[PDB]
Structure 1
Amino acid sequence: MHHHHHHSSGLVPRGSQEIEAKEACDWLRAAGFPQYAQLYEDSQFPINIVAVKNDHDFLEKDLVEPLCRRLNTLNKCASMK
């Protein structure tokens, strides 16, 4: 394994954040946790995410990961700048 071995990944958030936002909240309900989204409308989205994914979200680990994506996504768009 030569030193020329790695896996980089760019980042393009600022853009689809719009469609991602509406989905993020509309996804939490489809994922099985409509309790979270309910916060979006309240704007209480930005908060200790990590402590949240643990707080309630405990069903399926594959459902915990994406949960950090939407929350982390809206948590930014929920700032209304």
Structure 2
Amino acid sequence: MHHHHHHSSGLVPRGSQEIEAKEACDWLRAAGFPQYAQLYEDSQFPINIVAVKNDHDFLEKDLVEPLCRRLNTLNKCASMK
């Protein structure tokens, strides 16, 4: 029943982009960064992804790929400025 996350990976893009949108928000929360997920419906996803991910927040760079990809997949739909 109780858990924190599933796994720490994400390298399989497909045409199912409307289903990837669900997994994007939920993965951000699971990975320990729910602030980013909640900012989707507030129209605050596009806030310099490459800058905020480069603040050296964790030691491992493998976590920075899905932090980029899950932001990017919703960015298309958000279209803010």
TM over 0.5: yes
* Structure holding more helix per residue: 1
Check conservation: 2:53, 2:68, Cα contact below 8 A.
Answer: yes
TM superposition shift of 1:60? 2.9
Check conservation: 1:17, 1:77, Cα contact below 8 A.
Answer: no
TM superposition shift of 1:79? 3.0
Q: TM-score, normalised by structure 1?
A: 0.68
- The RMSD of aligned alpha carbons is 10.6
CA distance in structure 1 between the partners assigned to 2:21 and 2:68 by the alignment: 13
* Structure with max Cα Rg: 1
Paired residues, what number?
81
CA distance in structure 1 between the partners assigned to 2:66 and 2:60 by the alignment: 11
Structure 1: which 5+ runs fail to align? none
Q: TM-score, normalised by structure 2?
A: 0.68
String of CA shifts for 1:26-68, please: whole Å, max 9, x gaps: 1100111111101112111123110121247436322111110
TM superposition shift of 1:20? 0.8
Larger mean Cα displacement after TM superposition, 23-32 or 11-20: 11-20
Percent of aligned positions that are identical: 100
Structure 2: which 5+ runs fail to align? none
Check conservation: 1:47, 1:75, Cα contact below 8 A.
Answer: no
